[PDB]
């Protein structure tokens with residue numbers, strides 16, 4: 019598919035630089051009358067195809083040469099796949115206004131300090147409007163698995179856009195602030211031309227359970243526990259922490275946070291008023307072991323089995339302050355992100371060896387998702403009634419599911435646009451269509467440089483998982499064998515090819531050891547001259 023032409027004056031162009039064919043690094047660029055508005059700037063964490071890499075960024079080459087045009091960066095909420103790449107954007111232009119709610123802006127402040135950046139903040143709350151050049155924005159309360167999420171209406175001259183952010187429709191969130199479906203319904207009456215809609219759970223039928231179903235289950239588990247209780251969850255889910263604390267306090271226990279991410283984030287949550295707990299209900303971690311075990315609940319990180327997490331360390335008998343016993347109850351108040359199963363089940367099995375009881379979502383209602391199920395999205399589609407629909411935040415199977423949901427409410431199929439990263443969507447005179455594609459790749463972060471690591475380097479790293487045998491005589495290897503005498507049978511055969519007189523040395527003994535190995539050992543390490 020070809021690149022798009024110029025954008026008809028007065029129209030609007032929408033393009034994702036990440037987040038559409040995958041879960042992660044969401045970044046969406048809106049173009050209008052030469053100016054730019056960006057909604058979200060997240061990272062993607064690397065998989066097996068990307069060894070040695072730290073982060074994956076949205077493809078910023080597409081704004082690198084027009085950074086002067088960006089009017090603002092607007093942020094739905096504070097999860098890493100929406101804010102993680104902000105330091106790299108601000109390194110390109112440090113004074114881009116950054117718009118968001120108080121809790122969101124607190125997280126990017128802390129993230130941007132790691133890179134020695136001080137953002138220009140414009141702080142925003144639901145119900146408020148702000149102007150950013152040719153763009154105007156209005157913010158709608160969203161309930162999600164993290165406080166202070168916001169959905170965003172963008173008004174230009176081309177019409178009205180609505181971006182949901184990560185959206186869910188819990189009608190009884192513990193914090194009593196459900197998503198503002200009324201307000202978005204009234205905006206639908208106004209006429210919304212384009213709806214950008216979270217697809218994460220679009221293939222799950224029905225309506226998802228309330229986050230408030232978790233509290234009673236945790237209360238039941240703590241009441242029945244004879245010893246200490248340990249609850250692992252995500253530090254960003256303040257309403258989950260609040261329910262753990264409320265259950266523990268209601269049963270005469272005190273609470274302790276374990277792990278830097280948990281300690282830092284609950285500090286922010288307490289300061290901004292999202293977490294309400296009395297100082298006498300908290301114990302410092304280095305003083306929790308002084309009390310009776312049945313008097314403490316520990317709240318930790320490490321739901322994903324990351325080896326340096328607090329719960330991993332505890333499961334191996336290598337936590338400084340805490341030692342686990344068969345009398346402990348461990349609750350994984352979370353779900354298993356795909357690609358982490360081997361690691362999570364390893365921690366569970368180390369805990370089972372010790373004799374501790376482990377409770378996961380598979381056995382009890384200890385976790386709910388933060389994204390709307392298909393039946394909740396239907397409420398959104400009937401409430402907003404968008405003239406056109408673009409699914410975002412999802413892989414193809416999710417984007418397609420969301421497409422059908424919108425179709426089944428009456429959105430014409432020609433008005434349901436599926437635009438992968440790099441595919442533009444033009445909204446012109448009220449009609450919306452796909453207009454062309456540019457290529458987008460994965461920008462890698464590996465330490466202090468970036469951009470010198472690419473397909474060939476990852477290929478070499480993948481090959482090197484069988485070690486390497488290097489010739490340039492002295493034979494050496496590293497990921498190959500523990501037998502020192504294993505190099506010798508190749509030394510004789512190397513000189514033999516060296517009695518040959520007539521870079522061709524490279525392809526000469528590199529081909530000579532390669533035959534010796536794929537014959538003696540039937541291994542295939544990398545051979546380097």
Ligand SMILES: [Zn+2]
Pocket residue numbers: 095097184
């Ligand atoms: Zn999120």
Ligand SMILES: [Zn+2]
Pocket residue numbers: 097099100184411
């Ligand atoms: Zn997300």
